[PDB]
Design a protein around this ligand. Sequence first.
Ligand SMILES: [Mg+2]
Ligand SMILES: [Mg+2]
Ligand SMILES: [Mg+2]
Ligand SMILES: [Mg+2]
Ligand SMILES: [Mg+2]
Ligand SMILES: [Mg+2]
Lengths: 294, 294, 63, 63
Amino acid sequence: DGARRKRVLHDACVCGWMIEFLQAHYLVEDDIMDNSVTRRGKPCWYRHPDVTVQCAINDGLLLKSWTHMMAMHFFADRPFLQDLLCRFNRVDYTTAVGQLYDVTSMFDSNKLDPDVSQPTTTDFAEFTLSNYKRIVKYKTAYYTYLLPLVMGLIVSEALPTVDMGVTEELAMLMGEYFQVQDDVMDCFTPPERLGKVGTDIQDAKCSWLAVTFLAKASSAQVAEFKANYGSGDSEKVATVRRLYEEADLQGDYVAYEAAVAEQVKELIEKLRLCSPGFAASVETLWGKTYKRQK
Amino acid sequence: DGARRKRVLHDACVCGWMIEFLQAHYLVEDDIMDNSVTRRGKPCWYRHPDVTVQCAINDGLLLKSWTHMMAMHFFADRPFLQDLLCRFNRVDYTTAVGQLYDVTSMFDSNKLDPDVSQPTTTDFAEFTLSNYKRIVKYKTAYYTYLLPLVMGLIVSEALPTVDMGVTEELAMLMGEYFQVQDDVMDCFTPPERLGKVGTDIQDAKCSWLAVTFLAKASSAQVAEFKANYGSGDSEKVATVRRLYEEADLQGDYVAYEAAVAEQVKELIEKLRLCSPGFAASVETLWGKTYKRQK
Amino acid sequence: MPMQMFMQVYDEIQMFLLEELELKFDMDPNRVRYLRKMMDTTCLGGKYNRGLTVIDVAESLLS
Amino acid sequence: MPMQMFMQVYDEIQMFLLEELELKFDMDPNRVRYLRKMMDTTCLGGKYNRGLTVIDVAESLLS
Ligand SMILES: [Mg+2]
Ligand SMILES: [Mg+2]
Ligand SMILES: [Mg+2]
Ligand SMILES: [Mg+2]
Ligand SMILES: [Mg+2]
Ligand SMILES: [Mg+2]
């Protein structure tokens, strides 16, 4: 009965694609929303010569639908189908909510009314580590780190066998870090290694660099920041890059990374106690994240 | 035991909102895709002064997610919940395909390749009744006519009692006609009765008027249409309008309506036969379609 | 009457989702009010033919 | 091995979706080819960490 082994392995593969197809749907839409140019070495889907912006928005939705179509096909007769889809839609919605947070992080939330125009915030009062942790918790951690673990547990019919409280803590922790890494690469990793041209400075995003810079910078540094942040101009984007370098954020990063790595280390041990096999595959996922070059 | 009646009714309203929230999602995004101005008397969501384009894309996405969140909350304990969500997502997927058909109807499909740029068709060989019917069947009929009927059937636990083969024929026919009506108003009904400004001509869409004109018109008429269609220019647009009046499309409309009205009448009787309570509700639904002014 | 109860449940639904957003997704009041306006502006103001059909079909068939 | 089967199932899924499209949505081969390039361009080319993690968790646990 290497048939259980075949069925689980195949279902895991399908679930793997569901997420990848979910990721794909998000990147197509994120790129339009972020005004990105390039992705995985090539142009963003909406920037392909024969693809119109309107058709790209719709292509993004097709992608999302395919996740449901593939699940319904392959898992039609499976007792976990209803549980799988519940979770998968929860995470997806939570990811969409996270994107609300990201996409509105540059407006003063008190002046956030549909009926009335507003520009980018000039005092950046919301650019706090608190608000940052929220953005990232919902826009990345859930779909990137918690969902793949849970989907693996579901097709293995082993979901109840792990400490979910701890698993959730792990997923939240590694997910934040992965995002902080995304934000640092978006600024200091060259586009050709990365596959994409960074748009966080230009887009006046609440990136980790922004929020950490602002919590330690003098007022001279902050003023020069507020003059140069959220502009397409390359001399301006080049200053912000300098202001980060000058504030030694590479130091805050190493420290943050170390703190994440030891807390991650502890939680995996709490998880190894009753659930040693899950603990291993979590360690691998960590292994694919920690100090990733990408 | 008016409890069943209360439970069924309440489930019915929730499903009704699932569909209205779905519709809503489709309109936020259709409006961006179609580059529309106005909707239901007010600006299109993405055209609200304090609603950025990026955020309206996302908001459309939250709308879709809410259909799932409401279902899962209200129907959590409900035998039919998985049946309901399967069907709902199929329809939703079918609708998004229909939109691909719509949005790409202006490009020669033989030269439809992402990697390579291409302008709007200059010959319109794809503006056929055949292709029109395909657009409309998928983008409008399923969600607008089949899906409401089906949902009422599911919460009433009455789905197996009716002739689905006929129900589907009826849905397809009424849905076609609804869209033919939508296409005509776009061009001839004034924007303040309609609540929106028509964009079909400007967007160079495969409307029923377009395909019906093209199949009957002269070489000369067609050359003039080819020189004025798919352009925001208001003289060009006014020409196209004139060409539709001149070609007496209103004749063909009246004829199509009647053929539709009797073929609909025949199928409702085929249905009244084993299913009089449902046929009555299909007659009301037809009632809100036949010669609507909106 | 179909329309009366249809809007009652709209409020139930809205209340549930907006509150869940506050309670479980850490959402601030400003954004909660944004989503209230979004939700009303995009889901309300049409004629609800799709929604009202479901109720009708259900009322008819409980016989 | 994990990757090799993961792509195997990619080609199945892709086959099912594109054919279902042809057979039940009345889709011409042109649009079908459009969607194949779109699917490969958007789903393929990353490091597949989320997908591969699922298979990984599944292999580790079946024992
Ligand atoms: Mg973004
Ligand atoms: Mg981005
Ligand atoms: Mg980034
Ligand atoms: Mg449209
Ligand atoms: Mg439109
Ligand atoms: Mg229209």
